[PDB]
Design a protein around this ligand. Structure first.
Ligand SMILES: Cc1cn([C@H]2C[C@H](OP(=O)(O)O)[C@@H](COP(=O)(O)O)O2)c(=O)[nH]c1=O
Ligand SMILES: [Ca+2]
Length: 129
């Protein structure tokens, strides 16, 4: 896989963000994770965590996996990075997202993310508290 440039347009919630990619606005959905909706427990915390990460980044990148690049709602499906740090992993590591939506052929980072989830669960963080 390879990282590609994007720029922040607007934070949306814990696992979606609006980015400009190849010059076009798109809503991205983070691969392999599920944050609570804003109306659910830890939803506002997941939103704030992703907002801070993408707003403070000097450099955002997206990395597509090997499979589907957009979902049925037209959202981009990618791993998002903020100054080299994976958003998807960081949410899981902090107990603000569960590993989820693991479809065959877009699952390159699945075991990296599951290792982060096991760590957050051991630490009883957030969703795992
Ligand atoms: C993360 C992800 C979601 N989706 C679809 C599955 C779910 O469909 P349904 O809307 O029919 O439940 C939805 C979950 O996204 P959200 O968690 O953003 O609601 O997005 C994919 O198709 N591919 C993916 O990789
Ligand atoms: Ca969600």
């Amino acid at each position: 896989l390879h990282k590609e440039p994007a720029t922040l347009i607007k934070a949306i919630d814990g696992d979606t963000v609006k980015l400009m990619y190849k010059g076009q606005p798109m809503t991205f959905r983070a691969l392999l994770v599920d944050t609570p909706e804003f109306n659910e427990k830890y939803g506002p915390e997941a939103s704030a965590f992703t907002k801070k990460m993408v707003e403070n980044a000097k450099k955002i990148e997206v990395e597509f996996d090997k499979g589907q690049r957009t979902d049925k709602y037209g959202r981009g499906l990618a791993y998002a990075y903020a100054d080299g740090k994976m958003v998807n992993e960081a949410l899981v590591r902090q107990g603000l997202a569960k590993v989820a939506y693991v479809y065959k052929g877009n699952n390159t980072h699945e075991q990296l993310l599951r290792k982060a989830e096991a760590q957050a669960k051991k630490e009883k963080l957030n969703i795992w508290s």
